[PDB]
Amino acid sequence: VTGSGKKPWRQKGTGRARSGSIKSPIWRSGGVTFAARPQDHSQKVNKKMYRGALKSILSELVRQDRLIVVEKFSVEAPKTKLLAQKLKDMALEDVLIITGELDENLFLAARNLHKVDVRDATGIDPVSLIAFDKVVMTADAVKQVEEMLA
Amino acid sequence: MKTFTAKPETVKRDWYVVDATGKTLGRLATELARRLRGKHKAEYTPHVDTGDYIIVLNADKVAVTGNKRTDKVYYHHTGHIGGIKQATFEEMIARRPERVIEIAVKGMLPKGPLGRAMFRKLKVYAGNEHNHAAQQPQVLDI
Amino acid sequence: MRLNTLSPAEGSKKAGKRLGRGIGSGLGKTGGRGHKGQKSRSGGGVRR
Amino acid sequence: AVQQNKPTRSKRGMRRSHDALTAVTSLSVDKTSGEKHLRHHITADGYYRGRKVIAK
Amino acid sequence: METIAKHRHARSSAQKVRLVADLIRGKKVSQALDILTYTNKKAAVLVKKVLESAIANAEHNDGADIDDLKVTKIFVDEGPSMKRIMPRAKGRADRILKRTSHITVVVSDR
RNA sequence: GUAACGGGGCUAAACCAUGCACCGAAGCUGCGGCAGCGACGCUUAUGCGUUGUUGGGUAGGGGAGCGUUCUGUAAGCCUGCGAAGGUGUGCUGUGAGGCAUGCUGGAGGUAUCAGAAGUGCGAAUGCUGACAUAAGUAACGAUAAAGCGGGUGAAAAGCCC
RNA sequence: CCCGGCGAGGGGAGUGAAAAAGAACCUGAAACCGUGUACGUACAAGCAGUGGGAGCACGCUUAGGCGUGUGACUGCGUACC
């Protein structure tokens, strides 16, 4: 705290409580006893524990019928209208789409759709799988996930 | 239900006359205090004056056992530095006999505003005559 | 399986002591340090 | 020299029970001028007991 | 109908003014004016002006009459206090409060 | 200042012996309720049929919770048909508390389950601001001194003549 | 427009969804200071409460002896850290 280290008033003689610094935490306009510092909140996750969690999450999705598997998923042109129409045909609103190779056309079409996300097989994360109501994975995507999880 | 409590506006108080001639001072005072407080009534309530009006006659002829007639001393302080004054039982009887019974009963009554009110129902007379015939007091052989 | 339906295993998330926060907590007014002495002071205690 | 305890607002009011002002019981009326005035005092217009004392 | 007149931030402590206010509470306006006229207090001058203002308000804004008006309500509330410094002996400084008051007078034909 | 029964008073209302009653505690019992720890019906994804027993508490140890701000759940839900906050009332739990609603307020609030703490104040001759108290009391700063007429003014002991 | 000293400060009028948003201006808590109303209080002694409790006032609501405010009198009772 900006300020001098001078003692505000002498130790004895005055009828005031002893003070030693104008920056004392007890005082207004200076303090914070345990002022925070920038810190890293990251936690370690064992490789096996992370893989085990993904396997459990995927197993739950198939159990709850939240995992849809299709031979392929693509759009003719990079237009949000085409992707939105396609999702309506399949009756999907909040969907996470996983593909073997993230097509540029599909990626652009889904960018403006708030409830639609497109990822590659290697981009899946535990939170995304749980967060989205439905998960759509292509046949190729299932293959890569299988090898990655082993 | 709630226990019965006497109401001061509906409590019935009777008038009695007691002859103090030859009666032991203390043993007469206890009965007077008991009746002044109303302890003899089934409707007795600690916070209500349910007692009876009592007239005491011949207060100057109250009796005391032993040598108390000349040995009992009544002390009181006037509030000044000397203050302390005393009077024997004989001196009190000669000077103001009614105070002998009044002092005895007052000590036996409860202390506080209520006890002071109960004391007001006691009428002590030195002689054998009282001017409360209008109240039709009943003879009490106490 | 939703972000608001996951719970930790029982007995794996103990709360943690909070000293000097009232009589009810059982750790107020010297928070387990006892009374006057070197050990009760801030930074007090003897070396290894 | 100084108090050991803070006196109460009740005590403050009790002391001030004698601070109330007293209004004049009544005002005299000049017999001729007819205006009100303090008894034994001249009126605002210079009259007193209907004699028209100096009013300049 | 009751008419209100107020003098806010009057330069006088509420305690001093309340002494005069108690004199005329509940009195007829004609009687109240006489009382204030012959009260030798500064607050009397202040209160009289407020009372006269209330009387004028009743006429102009309500069409009332003096003969029926009376001081139904009157009170003084503490206003903001001005802080001042008073030098004392040996270099000590003292705080002076220049207290103000809000004077309210209500006149009704009741 | 009685002042060596607490008092009144007591010749028993004192003392000794004997006897029978009664008063007397948060002790014991009765009735209702809560909780901890044990064993029993392998009962039960366990509450009990029950069953005994325990529950004063500082330093201190152990166990279980309330509420506050913030992140996800939440582009959800509540909200100008009135949010937060403020102030009442009613109801409710063993407690920290919770729920509903009148008035004020005039735009934000946030379930649930998790996550993180600048997470709870009456005290430290604590810190800042506000406001009391003494009190309408002390004081109004050299005891060189003022009086009157007129003027001005809403108002003159203090200004002008 | 009106009172006021061609004041200060107010009362109307008008603007505005709102002026109890009027510039001493969003919300407007507490200490503290007032006005009004109900009840208590001038023969009574002390941590000011608690248990009991009359009276009064007020609200009831299908007399229903209930709620709310006050608290004469009375048992017990020497704050907190």
UniProtKB/Swiss-Prot annotation, chain E:
Gene3D superfamilies tied to this protein: Ribosomal protein L22/L17 (3.90.470.10)
Binding residues annotated for L-tryptophan, in chain numbering: K90
UniProt-listed Pfam families: Ribosomal_L22
Effect noted on mutating R8C: In strain: SK1048; decreases translational rate, tRNA binding and subunit association at 44 degrees Celsius; does not alter 23S rRNA or uL4 interactions; not erythromycin resistant
One GO biological process term: translation
Molecular functions (GO terms): large ribosomal subunit rRNA binding; structural constituent of ribosome
SUPFAM superfamilies with a match to the protein in the record: Ribosomal protein L22 (SSF54843)
InterPro entries the UniProt entry points to: Ribosomal_uL22, Ribosomal_uL22_bac/chlpt-type, Ribosomal_uL22_bac/org-type, Ribosomal_uL22_CS, Ribosomal_uL22_sf
One GO CC term on file: cytosolic large ribosomal subunit
Keywords: Antibiotic resistance, Ribonucleoprotein, Ribosomal protein, RNA-binding, rRNA-binding
Similarity remark: Belongs to the universal ribosomal protein uL22 family.
Oligomer and partners: Part of the 50S ribosomal subunit. In TnaC-stalled ribosomes forms part of the binding pocket for L-Trp with the leader peptide and uL4.
Function: This protein binds specifically to 23S rRNA; its binding is stimulated by other ribosomal proteins, e.g. uL4, bL17, and bL20. It is important during the early stages of 50S assembly. It makes multiple contacts with different domains of the 23S rRNA in the assembled 50S subunit and ribosome.
Additional comment: The wild-type allele (erythromycin sensitive) is dominant over the resistant allele, and is also dominant over the temperature-sensitive allele at both low and high temperatures.
Protein name: Large ribosomal subunit protein uL22
Lineage: Bacteria, Pseudomonadati, Pseudomonadota, Gammaproteobacteria, Enterobacterales
